[PDB]
Design a protein around this ligand. Sequence first.
Ligand SMILES: [Cl-]
Ligand SMILES: [Cl-]
Ligand SMILES: [Cl-]
Ligand SMILES: [Mg+2]
Ligand SMILES: [Mg+2]
Ligand SMILES: [Mg+2]
Ligand SMILES: [Mg+2]
Ligand SMILES: [Mg+2]
Ligand SMILES: [Mg+2]
Ligand SMILES: [Mg+2]
Ligand SMILES: [Mg+2]
Ligand SMILES: [Mg+2]
Ligand SMILES: [Mg+2]
Ligand SMILES: [Mg+2]
Ligand SMILES: [Mg+2]
Ligand SMILES: [Mg+2]
Ligand SMILES: [Mg+2]
Ligand SMILES: [Mg+2]
Ligand SMILES: [Mg+2]
Ligand SMILES: [Mg+2]
Ligand SMILES: [Mg+2]
Ligand SMILES: [Mg+2]
Ligand SMILES: [Mg+2]
Ligand SMILES: [Mg+2]
Ligand SMILES: [Mg+2]
Ligand SMILES: [Mg+2]
Ligand SMILES: [Mg+2]
Lengths: 53, 171, 146, 185, 159
Amino acid sequence: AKSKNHTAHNQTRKAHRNGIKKPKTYKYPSLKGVDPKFRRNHKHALHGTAKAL
Amino acid sequence: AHFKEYQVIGRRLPTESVPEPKLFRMRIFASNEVIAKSRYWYFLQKLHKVKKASGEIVSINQINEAHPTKVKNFGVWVRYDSRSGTHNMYKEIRDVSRVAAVETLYQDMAARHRARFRSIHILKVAEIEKTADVKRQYVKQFLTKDLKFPLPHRVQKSTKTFSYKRPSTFY
Amino acid sequence: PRKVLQLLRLTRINSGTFVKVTKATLELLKLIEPYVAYGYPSYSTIRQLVYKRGFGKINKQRVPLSDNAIIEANLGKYGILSIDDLIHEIITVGPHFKQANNFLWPFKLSNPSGGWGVPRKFKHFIQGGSFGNREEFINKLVKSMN
Amino acid sequence: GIDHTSKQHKRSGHRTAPKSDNVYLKLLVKLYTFLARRTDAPFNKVVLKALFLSKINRPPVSVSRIARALKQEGAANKTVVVVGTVTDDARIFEFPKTTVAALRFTAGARAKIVKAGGECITLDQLAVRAPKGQNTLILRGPRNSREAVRHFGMGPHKGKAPRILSTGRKFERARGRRRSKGFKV
Amino acid sequence: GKSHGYRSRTRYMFQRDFRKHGAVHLSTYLKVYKVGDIVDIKANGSIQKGMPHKFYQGKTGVVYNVTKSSVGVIINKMVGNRYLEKRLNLRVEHIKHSKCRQEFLERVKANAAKRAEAKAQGVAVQLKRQPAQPRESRIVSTEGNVPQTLAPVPYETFI
RNA sequence: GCAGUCAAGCGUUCAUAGCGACAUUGCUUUUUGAUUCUUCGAUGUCGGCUCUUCCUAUCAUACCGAAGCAGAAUUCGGUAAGCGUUGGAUUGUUCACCCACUAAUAGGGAACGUGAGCUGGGUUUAGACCGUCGUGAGACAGGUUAGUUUUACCCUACUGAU
RNA sequence: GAGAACAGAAAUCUCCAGUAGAACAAAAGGGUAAAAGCCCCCUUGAUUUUGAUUUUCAGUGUGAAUACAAACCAUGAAAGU
RNA sequence: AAGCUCGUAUCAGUUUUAUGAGGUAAAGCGAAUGAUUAGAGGUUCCGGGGUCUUGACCUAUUCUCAAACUUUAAAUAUGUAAGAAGUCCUUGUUACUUAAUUGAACGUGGACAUUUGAAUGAAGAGCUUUUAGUGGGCCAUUUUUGGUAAGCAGAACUGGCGAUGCGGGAUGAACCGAACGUAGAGUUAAGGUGCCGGAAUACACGCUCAUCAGACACCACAAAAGGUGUUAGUUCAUCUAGACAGGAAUGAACUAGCCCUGAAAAUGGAUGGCGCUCAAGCGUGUUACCUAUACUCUACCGUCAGGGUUGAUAUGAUGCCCUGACGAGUAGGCAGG
RNA sequence: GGAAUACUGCCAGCUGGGACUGAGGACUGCGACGUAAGUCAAGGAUGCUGGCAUAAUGGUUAUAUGCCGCCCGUCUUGAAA
RNA sequence: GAAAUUGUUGAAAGGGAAGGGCAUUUGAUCAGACA
Ligand SMILES: [Cl-]
Ligand SMILES: [Cl-]
Ligand SMILES: [Cl-]
Ligand SMILES: [Mg+2]
Ligand SMILES: [Mg+2]
Ligand SMILES: [Mg+2]
Ligand SMILES: [Mg+2]
Ligand SMILES: [Mg+2]
Ligand SMILES: [Mg+2]
Ligand SMILES: [Mg+2]
Ligand SMILES: [Mg+2]
Ligand SMILES: [Mg+2]
Ligand SMILES: [Mg+2]
Ligand SMILES: [Mg+2]
Ligand SMILES: [Mg+2]
Ligand SMILES: [Mg+2]
Ligand SMILES: [Mg+2]
Ligand SMILES: [Mg+2]
Ligand SMILES: [Mg+2]
Ligand SMILES: [Mg+2]
Ligand SMILES: [Mg+2]
Ligand SMILES: [Mg+2]
Ligand SMILES: [Mg+2]
Ligand SMILES: [Mg+2]
Ligand SMILES: [Mg+2]
Ligand SMILES: [Mg+2]
Ligand SMILES: [Mg+2]
């Protein structure tokens, strides 16, 4: 016996029950994927200014 | 409905490049001012590059019949769409006002040709000033000298279900 | 169109609200045209709507406007201290139209007393129906529903 | 008909009363319900809501945490308020002479506070002394240090603790956890 | 069977413009991108390296990383019933500065200038935009502009 | 399967008495397909026999119109289903094909009418034979022979009777 | 297209025009002209160590691909690749 | 379902302003590629008969086309932005970077308040744990593939049925109207008002006579082709200088309204029925009137939310009281009895 | 040349008839009318009167009449089948 | 000493089922207050 293959009917209505939520924004975002050489020096810049203050 | 005649004067929106745009006027038969202004833009978009979003209505005024108690012979030119094609027609209507003649015209077109309001354009309504310029025989017969005719077979209206006498149709 | 009706506080049939006319609001009206009837209110229509069916939104509650004291206690900081001051802020779209209009609970109207005047409502007013913009004719319709 | 934009007949989702049947706890709720209604003091409303919390929402507060808070600038003479249990901590060797108000004190915690010259009082004694929370300091324990939290949100690349009974070499360290066996997470 | 390759259904999207083939002009390589800039994505078909996937064509994002010949862009993608952040490594040939906010910075500068000049003289600085307003009353003259009557035309064929 | 429209042509001459190419519009559900909605805690299945009623796209009979209708014979068409439409050889056959009579031997429906009405020749259980196919068990919408057809006293319908 | 003994429609040589109507291992679609095509010269980066990212996607795996970091090399006058 | 952190806060199935992306509809072929009709003017030491024809090309034209052609190119959908995590000034850190304190990133210090940066709304926003059922679907409008077609098969967006009663379409899972606690009064929706049947055998201008009239969306069918039936209209010609027929109009060719021919199936039969003919039919216009569990106002029950009240001497602070809103439901969840 | 009237709209103008409803239960509020005392239609009905005091109203039950009402449970896209 | 089922007596209805919902008429029967 055969059956239906695919349909997107009712899928948008399900998505709008609780979903369609914009991501929460944070200051100080993740530094993942940033250039390692930049991060290596940026670490030393933060250490120096902490001692000064 | 009971039609009324309006004059609608419109213009294109003034611009820095082209100030004082030309004023355009036309006479519209409609039930109320809301329909009249709608009809004005409908015909204007068939003649000039303009629409409501780029235009302005300057004045709308009701036009009354100058002599509403004088019998007149009107000549009416119309353009209408049938089930297959468009046709031009000429008809003659005898009444006392333009609005009364136009109301008769719409009833006649719907009865004889099944033409709705949306399918009819009134090209021109004018009064035939002189006799012998009438060219439809169903109007000429009422122009004869000393016209007289009876009303045979009069049917009276009864307010009761039962009548105690055989009615007569004399007149 | 369902979303626009919610944003205009029209969640049931025969409900009404006032709307300031701008380019941002005229495009809203075109989206809900086959579901609403609107026009230009007169002073008498505004006066009778507020006097008879005027309710205020206080602490998320619907409170009748039975005295000038409650109006002053909620709109006094905008200079509105009587029912006529509230009416004046509506007919003349003043600086505080948004606050004054949002203070009014959406009007709960009845069906027209002499009917709608047409055999079928869900056509445009130009085509002999009911919906769309009917301009000054809104006054007659609202007074029969109020 | 009404086009509803939100769910109807929805409860607030916050506890309005303690779930316990402790008769003495109900008396404290009755005391602070009266105070919160007739003082317009933000302290009284916070204490009343804290009395409704469950056990996991009231983690214990150790005396070392109390001592650290007293080291804040200008907080040396403030009354520490803990809506919960205060436990003892032997890792600290010096304790101040503060006043602590809490629902419960362990035997070690009460002895350590009294030995240092302080006093332990109940929440109703605090209300008499500070009806509007004058010169008070509210301390809460850590909620995310609970053992159950580390399993929440399990999944690939999440770095959470799996729910396992026996931990060892042969327990969930094979394929799926190292590159030499198929793949790593 | 079905085909769902990386560049499927991109027959027209990645084509060059008409009479605009060949090498890339040097102003593309001279622009400077910094972390926080808003850029838009438009793949260039003649550069096969650092090419974005077809989904991100016409999308706008924020730069988070700068490399030798490429930048890193943050894109929010709607997956199911939520948005997820996507990080793209794109060469500079496929991006350009976004004008959606360069104009906004001009209004920020103009607001401060009008705020300062009114600080000493006038209250109610009124630094908010307004939508289009209904027109005011006016008088239209007919001097040399007498209205001309128009009528509907009869039907004709002219084929 | 049946019926129209157009009219190049056929018909000695003459498109349409009677026919009619190239095209084009329909109707019917007595063909066969397409589909899988109903029924697998079951609606008895091919043909014949028997019996009633219905449809008209009329074979015969009644009354007429038309012809390249002299008569005789025949052909085309109209109103018409009132009334009839058979006896046999071969085949299980529906179908088909001949013999003969006849005014004529027209086409169909009713759960492809009709098995608690019959019959059981065919198809389609288990026995057996042949041919081809398969190493074999076995297969074949190929042929051949032998193979249990149950119950009404209930309700309604119908026929008669108080 | 115009020219040169055998030489002709197609052998080799010369000039002019030529936006790609050629070519680029393969199916098709993109891309490419002082090149990504043709010829010549030198080479092994088709290397080492582990992470991040894109596509299919549950944001699992596999396949493929993108941009860096830390090394060691090739090529070029060089920028670079 | 349990809640938790907070409460003016940011959000939004929406618009606006500014700025991007796309190659479908349409359009185009004297624009590329590929099809395709017709001639015309030229060109051969380089096709083949013949002393001049037919093919080939080239130039200027011409008719018609494309899901896997295209220069151009919408509508609807679609990305981002519209501030305090912002703007401006001065100068601190570093092993990164620069010829160079040059730059990059992150900071110290100073200034700028909510017409603080468009509109509207916001039964508050944010967040976490755990678990049920489900994983055969189907229908309608629009877009759309295969097929002659199908109450056929397969996709796209939305709304529905399933899970749903109520008024209307005679009757019907999906159409129209409208969604439902218990009652009273009023007004309406869609649909109707000769009788069945609640409500005008109302008004107004026309059209139609059928020996098989017609009568309301989804919907329960009818075509090509015809008619000196009747109605209106288009063009042309004749006619006062007497036409047509044998004293005022007439002839021809066409157009589209209603009616008629075209129009044949099986038990007896269905605009729902009766019946209806200046309609109770068809087209159109104006008013009155009838009635839904919908709308407006009031009462009562329950649910949710926001509040008031511990003072003793009279009993329930899980008590009593004030205010506002809300009420459909299969599988399934929880609560009080 | 001077009016009237129609049509549309407004009145914090006046006034007659009919129907449904009476929630609440000391006082507190906002107004009106008055020199004042006070009064009032101002945060929800009172006043006067008649008959009967029992099957009269009402409840229950059987029946009649008007309209409506298909057999429950189950699988299913769909069950009176 | 229950129900299915049955006899007798009494009451009521019945033109191709019976049973049900809303409302009232008729018959039968019955509680509450006479402050
Ligand atoms: Cl579906
Ligand atoms: Cl075998
Ligand atoms: Cl009855
Ligand atoms: Mg009425
Ligand atoms: Mg209606
Ligand atoms: Mg199917
Ligand atoms: Mg059975
Ligand atoms: Mg059986
Ligand atoms: Mg049977
Ligand atoms: Mg049979
Ligand atoms: Mg049998
Ligand atoms: Mg039988
Ligand atoms: Mg046999
Ligand atoms: Mg056998
Ligand atoms: Mg495409
Ligand atoms: Mg096209
Ligand atoms: Mg189901
Ligand atoms: Mg029907
Ligand atoms: Mg009646
Ligand atoms: Mg009519
Ligand atoms: Mg419910
Ligand atoms: Mg009684
Ligand atoms: Mg019934
Ligand atoms: Mg089934
Ligand atoms: Mg069932
Ligand atoms: Mg016994
Ligand atoms: Mg018994």
